[PDB]
Tab-separated table of C-alpha atoms in Angstrom:
chain	number	residue	atom	x	y	z
A	1	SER	CA	-5.075	59.984	-24.445
A	2	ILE	CA	-4.699	57.669	-26.394
A	3	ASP	CA	-6.522	55.440	-29.110
A	4	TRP	CA	-4.888	52.214	-28.442
A	5	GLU	CA	-6.699	50.433	-30.887
A	6	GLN	CA	-7.185	52.675	-33.210
A	7	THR	CA	-3.443	53.085	-32.552
A	8	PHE	CA	-2.909	49.680	-32.876
A	9	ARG	CA	-4.766	48.991	-36.156
A	10	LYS	CA	-3.108	52.041	-38.017
A	11	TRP	CA	0.553	50.461	-36.741
A	12	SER	CA	-0.519	47.275	-37.673
A	13	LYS	CA	-0.323	48.731	-41.712
A	14	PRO	CA	2.022	46.675	-44.074
A	15	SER	CA	4.509	48.827	-46.558
A	16	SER	CA	6.736	45.261	-51.926
A	17	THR	CA	9.078	45.912	-54.631
A	18	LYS	CA	12.123	47.068	-52.098
A	19	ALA	CA	13.094	43.414	-51.301
A	20	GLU	CA	12.393	42.631	-55.395
A	21	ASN	CA	14.496	44.841	-56.089
A	22	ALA	CA	17.679	44.657	-53.418
A	23	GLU	CA	17.716	40.574	-54.642
A	24	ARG	CA	17.697	41.827	-58.163
A	25	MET	CA	19.981	43.870	-57.808
A	26	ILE	CA	23.055	41.782	-56.190
A	27	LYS	CA	21.615	38.877	-58.531
A	28	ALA	CA	23.041	40.600	-61.213
A	29	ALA	CA	25.971	42.186	-59.130
A	30	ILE	CA	26.874	37.905	-59.003
A	31	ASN	CA	26.100	37.064	-62.504
A	32	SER	CA	28.508	40.101	-63.938
A	33	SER	CA	31.427	38.405	-61.851
A	34	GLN	CA	32.927	35.671	-64.148
A	35	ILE	CA	34.053	32.865	-61.181
A	36	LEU	CA	30.466	33.572	-59.540
A	37	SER	CA	28.623	33.388	-62.249
A	38	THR	CA	29.538	29.836	-62.919
A	39	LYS	CA	28.359	28.989	-59.340
A	40	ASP	CA	25.912	26.714	-57.607
A	41	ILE	CA	24.423	30.374	-55.543
A	42	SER	CA	21.333	31.177	-54.311
A	43	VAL	CA	19.938	35.238	-53.942
A	44	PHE	CA	16.561	35.593	-51.811
A	45	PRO	CA	15.563	38.141	-49.290
A	46	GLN	CA	14.838	36.838	-45.912
A	47	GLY	CA	14.038	38.762	-42.295
A	48	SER	CA	11.590	41.122	-41.287
A	49	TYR	CA	10.985	42.178	-45.804
A	50	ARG	CA	11.209	38.879	-46.347
A	51	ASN	CA	8.140	38.029	-43.649
A	52	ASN	CA	6.289	40.963	-44.357
A	53	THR	CA	7.285	42.282	-40.875
A	54	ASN	CA	9.233	45.349	-41.265
A	55	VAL	CA	7.644	48.441	-40.346
A	56	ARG	CA	10.008	50.690	-40.641
A	57	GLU	CA	10.369	52.562	-44.524
A	58	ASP	CA	14.353	53.321	-44.215
A	59	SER	CA	15.453	49.842	-42.447
A	60	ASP	CA	17.496	47.875	-45.135
A	61	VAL	CA	16.746	45.183	-46.856
A	62	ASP	CA	18.425	41.316	-45.718
A	63	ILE	CA	19.870	39.827	-48.230
A	64	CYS	CA	21.064	35.957	-48.034
A	65	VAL	CA	23.734	34.960	-50.957
A	66	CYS	CA	24.379	31.429	-50.381
A	67	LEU	CA	27.393	29.239	-52.135
A	68	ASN	CA	24.632	26.151	-52.318
A	69	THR	CA	27.335	23.636	-52.997
A	70	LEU	CA	29.427	24.264	-49.837
A	71	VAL	CA	27.996	22.046	-46.867
A	72	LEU	CA	28.461	22.637	-43.438
A	73	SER	CA	26.690	20.384	-40.695
A	74	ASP	CA	25.603	19.920	-37.569
A	75	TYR	CA	25.949	15.841	-36.096
A	76	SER	CA	25.159	17.452	-32.534
A	77	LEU	CA	21.605	15.223	-32.408
A	78	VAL	CA	22.951	11.968	-33.817
A	79	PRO	CA	26.005	9.815	-32.531
A	80	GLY	CA	28.146	8.237	-34.968
A	81	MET	CA	27.101	10.933	-37.827
A	82	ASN	CA	29.675	12.886	-39.490
A	83	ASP	CA	31.545	13.664	-42.795
A	84	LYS	CA	31.714	9.899	-44.044
A	85	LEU	CA	28.279	8.766	-43.672
A	86	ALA	CA	27.234	11.974	-44.535
A	87	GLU	CA	28.477	11.848	-48.210
A	88	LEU	CA	30.982	14.918	-47.703
A	89	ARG	CA	32.902	15.724	-50.860
A	90	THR	CA	35.907	18.001	-50.468
A	91	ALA	CA	36.578	21.148	-52.339
A	92	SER	CA	39.137	23.382	-52.999
A	93	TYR	CA	36.747	26.337	-53.142
A	94	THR	CA	36.517	27.750	-49.777
A	95	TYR	CA	33.989	30.070	-47.581
A	96	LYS	CA	37.133	33.316	-47.609
A	97	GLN	CA	37.746	33.096	-51.366
A	98	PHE	CA	33.572	32.820	-51.667
A	99	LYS	CA	33.208	35.686	-49.694
A	100	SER	CA	36.360	37.632	-51.089
A	101	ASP	CA	34.779	37.540	-54.505
A	102	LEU	CA	31.662	38.627	-53.474
A	103	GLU	CA	32.933	41.599	-52.142
A	104	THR	CA	35.113	41.900	-55.750
A	105	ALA	CA	31.638	41.899	-57.092
A	106	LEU	CA	29.455	44.424	-55.044
A	107	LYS	CA	32.570	46.416	-55.294
A	108	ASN	CA	31.986	46.131	-58.923
A	109	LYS	CA	28.526	46.841	-59.551
A	110	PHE	CA	27.945	49.907	-56.766
A	111	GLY	CA	31.025	51.362	-55.756
A	112	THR	CA	33.555	50.800	-53.025
A	113	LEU	CA	31.812	53.915	-51.813
A	114	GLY	CA	28.369	51.581	-51.068
A	115	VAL	CA	30.001	48.959	-49.738
A	116	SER	CA	31.388	48.001	-46.248
A	117	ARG	CA	32.101	44.571	-45.067
A	118	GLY	CA	31.024	43.757	-41.769
A	119	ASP	CA	31.306	40.386	-39.119
A	120	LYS	CA	29.309	38.864	-41.221
A	121	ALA	CA	27.315	40.760	-43.537
A	122	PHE	CA	28.928	43.584	-45.984
A	123	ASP	CA	26.689	46.602	-45.530
A	124	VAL	CA	25.716	48.111	-49.192
A	125	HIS	CA	24.219	51.761	-50.001
A	126	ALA	CA	23.506	52.417	-53.889
A	127	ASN	CA	20.944	55.124	-54.816
A	128	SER	CA	21.656	54.347	-58.803
A	129	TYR	CA	20.071	51.137	-57.608
A	130	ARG	CA	17.924	52.005	-54.938
A	131	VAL	CA	19.813	49.521	-53.089
A	132	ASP	CA	20.052	49.665	-49.033
A	133	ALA	CA	20.941	46.123	-48.246
A	134	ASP	CA	22.527	43.615	-45.707
A	135	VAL	CA	24.325	40.986	-47.676
A	136	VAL	CA	25.324	37.830	-45.828
A	137	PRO	CA	27.596	35.663	-47.598
A	138	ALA	CA	26.472	32.145	-46.185
A	139	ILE	CA	26.283	28.149	-47.233
A	140	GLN	CA	24.639	25.593	-47.095
A	141	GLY	CA	24.000	24.584	-43.333
A	142	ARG	CA	22.829	21.019	-42.231
A	143	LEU	CA	21.136	19.323	-39.333
A	144	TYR	CA	20.709	15.903	-39.363
A	145	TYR	CA	18.547	14.171	-37.075
A	146	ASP	CA	18.911	10.526	-38.081
A	147	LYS	CA	22.371	8.376	-39.578
A	148	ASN	CA	21.206	8.822	-42.881
A	149	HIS	CA	22.935	11.471	-45.572
A	150	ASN	CA	19.393	13.210	-46.570
A	151	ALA	CA	17.657	12.929	-42.829
A	152	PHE	CA	18.444	16.275	-41.860
A	153	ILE	CA	17.519	20.206	-42.432
A	154	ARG	CA	18.932	22.021	-44.581
A	155	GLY	CA	19.455	26.206	-43.764
A	156	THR	CA	22.223	28.797	-44.499
A	157	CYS	CA	25.414	28.428	-42.730
A	158	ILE	CA	27.482	31.698	-41.479
A	159	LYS	CA	31.626	31.816	-41.075
A	160	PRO	CA	31.571	35.240	-39.507
A	161	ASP	CA	34.887	37.427	-39.966
A	162	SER	CA	35.839	36.963	-36.188
A	163	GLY	CA	35.016	32.934	-36.293
A	164	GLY	CA	32.878	30.971	-34.938
A	165	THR	CA	29.897	29.609	-36.746
A	166	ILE	CA	26.484	30.483	-36.675
A	167	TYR	CA	23.277	28.461	-38.528
A	168	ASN	CA	20.126	31.030	-39.593
A	169	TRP	CA	16.343	28.807	-41.082
A	170	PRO	CA	15.107	31.297	-43.177
A	171	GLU	CA	13.134	29.244	-44.847
A	172	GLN	CA	11.821	27.533	-42.084
A	173	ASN	CA	11.157	31.023	-40.234
A	174	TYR	CA	9.160	32.291	-43.040
A	175	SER	CA	7.040	29.155	-44.060
A	176	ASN	CA	6.162	29.201	-40.073
A	177	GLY	CA	5.090	32.456	-40.147
A	178	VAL	CA	2.936	31.918	-42.907
A	179	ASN	CA	1.282	29.076	-41.462
A	180	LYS	CA	1.140	30.871	-38.415
A	181	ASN	CA	-0.959	34.007	-40.509
A	182	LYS	CA	-2.936	31.601	-41.842
A	183	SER	CA	-4.497	30.005	-38.812
A	184	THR	CA	-4.978	33.103	-37.291
A	185	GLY	CA	-6.946	34.631	-40.128
A	186	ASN	CA	-4.141	37.004	-40.873
A	187	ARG	CA	-3.646	38.471	-37.596
A	188	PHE	CA	-0.153	37.317	-36.523
A	189	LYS	CA	2.030	39.510	-38.515
A	190	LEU	CA	-0.896	42.329	-38.116
A	191	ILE	CA	-0.278	42.047	-34.106
A	192	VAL	CA	4.116	41.372	-34.659
A	193	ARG	CA	3.949	45.075	-36.504
A	194	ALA	CA	1.724	46.949	-34.144
A	195	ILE	CA	3.910	45.216	-31.150
A	196	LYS	CA	7.299	45.610	-33.230
A	197	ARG	CA	5.911	49.695	-33.510
A	198	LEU	CA	5.227	49.702	-30.093
A	199	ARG	CA	8.846	49.242	-29.251
A	200	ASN	CA	10.174	51.575	-31.415
A	201	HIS	CA	7.319	53.940	-30.262
A	202	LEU	CA	9.462	53.241	-26.956
A	203	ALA	CA	12.302	53.276	-27.823
A	204	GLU	CA	12.495	56.613	-29.066
A	205	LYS	CA	10.855	57.899	-26.213
A	206	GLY	CA	13.653	56.883	-24.104
A	207	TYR	CA	12.474	53.913	-22.250
A	208	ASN	CA	15.618	51.571	-22.125
A	209	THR	CA	14.023	48.578	-21.630
A	210	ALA	CA	12.965	49.108	-25.169
A	211	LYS	CA	16.467	49.394	-26.511
A	212	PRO	CA	17.587	45.487	-26.962
A	213	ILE	CA	14.529	44.031	-27.793
A	214	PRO	CA	15.036	44.103	-31.609
A	215	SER	CA	12.720	42.857	-34.362
A	216	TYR	CA	13.576	39.292	-34.607
A	217	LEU	CA	12.881	38.747	-31.231
A	218	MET	CA	9.560	40.605	-31.300
A	219	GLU	CA	8.433	38.358	-34.011
A	220	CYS	CA	9.742	35.074	-32.069
A	221	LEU	CA	7.719	36.323	-28.697
A	222	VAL	CA	4.781	37.159	-30.502
A	223	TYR	CA	4.951	33.723	-32.688
A	224	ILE	CA	5.236	32.010	-29.364
A	225	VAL	CA	1.023	32.784	-27.771
A	226	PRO	CA	-0.850	30.451	-29.128
A	227	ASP	CA	-3.147	31.293	-31.385
A	228	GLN	CA	-6.148	31.469	-29.161
A	229	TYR	CA	-5.010	35.215	-28.372
A	230	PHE	CA	-5.165	36.195	-31.420
A	231	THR	CA	-8.965	36.072	-32.143
A	232	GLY	CA	-11.297	38.658	-31.239
A	233	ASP	CA	-11.992	42.557	-32.960
A	234	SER	CA	-9.832	44.323	-30.498
A	235	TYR	CA	-5.869	44.790	-31.481
A	236	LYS	CA	-5.627	45.818	-28.130
A	237	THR	CA	-6.355	43.145	-26.776
A	238	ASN	CA	-4.763	41.646	-28.848
A	239	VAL	CA	-1.216	42.640	-27.507
A	240	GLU	CA	-2.892	42.480	-24.128
A	241	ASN	CA	-3.075	39.106	-24.507
A	242	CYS	CA	0.684	38.774	-26.127
A	243	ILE	CA	1.899	40.597	-23.308
A	244	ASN	CA	0.127	38.459	-20.614
A	245	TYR	CA	1.193	35.065	-21.809
A	246	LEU	CA	5.157	36.328	-22.518
A	247	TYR	CA	5.890	37.196	-19.381
A	248	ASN	CA	4.155	35.276	-17.176
A	249	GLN	CA	5.268	32.309	-18.523
A	250	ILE	CA	8.709	33.399	-20.371
A	251	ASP	CA	10.236	32.062	-16.335
A	252	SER	CA	9.303	28.314	-16.495
A	253	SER	CA	9.780	28.772	-20.411
A	254	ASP	CA	12.116	26.888	-23.241
A	255	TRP	CA	11.250	28.266	-26.383
A	256	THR	CA	12.644	28.238	-29.768
A	257	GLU	CA	12.960	31.187	-32.196
A	258	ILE	CA	9.899	30.845	-35.173
A	259	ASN	CA	12.345	28.111	-37.399
A	260	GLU	CA	11.259	26.039	-33.980
A	261	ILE	CA	15.132	24.903	-33.694
A	262	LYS	CA	16.940	27.147	-32.055
A	263	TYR	CA	16.634	27.911	-28.783
A	264	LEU	CA	15.188	32.045	-27.963
A	265	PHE	CA	17.208	32.325	-25.119
A	266	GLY	CA	21.084	30.612	-24.781
A	267	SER	CA	24.220	31.867	-24.901
A	268	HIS	CA	24.281	32.382	-28.186
A	269	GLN	CA	21.821	34.955	-27.781
A	270	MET	CA	23.074	38.714	-27.195
A	271	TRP	CA	19.867	38.847	-25.290
A	272	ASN	CA	18.393	37.074	-21.888
A	273	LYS	CA	14.476	36.353	-20.877
A	274	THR	CA	15.337	39.152	-18.565
A	275	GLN	CA	15.166	42.008	-20.536
A	276	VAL	CA	12.244	40.737	-22.271
A	277	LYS	CA	10.155	40.588	-19.248
A	278	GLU	CA	11.095	44.063	-18.397
A	279	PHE	CA	10.535	45.614	-21.703
A	280	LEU	CA	6.772	43.413	-21.207
A	281	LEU	CA	6.571	45.160	-18.471
A	282	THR	CA	6.990	49.068	-19.593
A	283	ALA	CA	4.536	48.208	-22.012
A	284	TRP	CA	1.769	46.766	-20.478
A	285	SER	CA	2.360	50.128	-18.343
A	286	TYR	CA	2.614	52.067	-21.225
A	287	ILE	CA	-0.744	51.206	-22.801
A	288	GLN	CA	-3.387	50.710	-19.929
A	289	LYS	CA	-6.249	52.995	-19.297
A	290	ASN	CA	-6.783	55.997	-16.295
A	291	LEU	CA	-3.194	56.167	-15.511
A	292	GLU	CA	-2.656	59.575	-14.303
């Protein structure tokens, strides 16, 4: 027997200074770089630690280092919009030089043994500064919605070493999560944590359906569930409402990420709605009562 109400209430508990320490140490690594200290660079958390949805004690902090003066624009929505109308200035400093200089600064502060270069981010681990971070080099990304040099949504843009382009909207993710947590009486992020820990519990116990469901996907999926299903006094009922809605609405769905900009499913995502439906069925079966 399992008191799933009690288990979901315990799994909804939050963790505060980890993200702040990571940001401060990466910022200090940048400020000690001669070339990067003069640049217009922002350092800020993103992901679960930013959104207060982190549930694993040993998970890395997602830190974004954004060079704000390099701009990459998505013109797909506005016919006629281009660099000329957007007043894009040509720049000598490139994304590769920025990433290489950031790698040099990270190695300078934290040591080469603690810095590893990946396709998208740097894996940083330095116990001397208590830093366990995924540090993403990004530039200013824009999504225009009108033929006007200011009519755009601003986020971050990543150029992986293996080619291609990626757009992130960390501020939008954060603010949308904050607003949904406000309109649900802080139950939204509680249920996010509970369901993420449910997925982790299922993955550790060998359920294959829980393996390809990462944290950000869970946060997006739970954000999609309407607010009416987060009311009441039973956390288990909220989890079951979320699973029911997501399971019976996903086939006809045309959902977006929590930023309400990027589509949740598509060629740009490594997940598909079949995996999500299978995981939802597994979780539902796992939490039911009187099941032999």
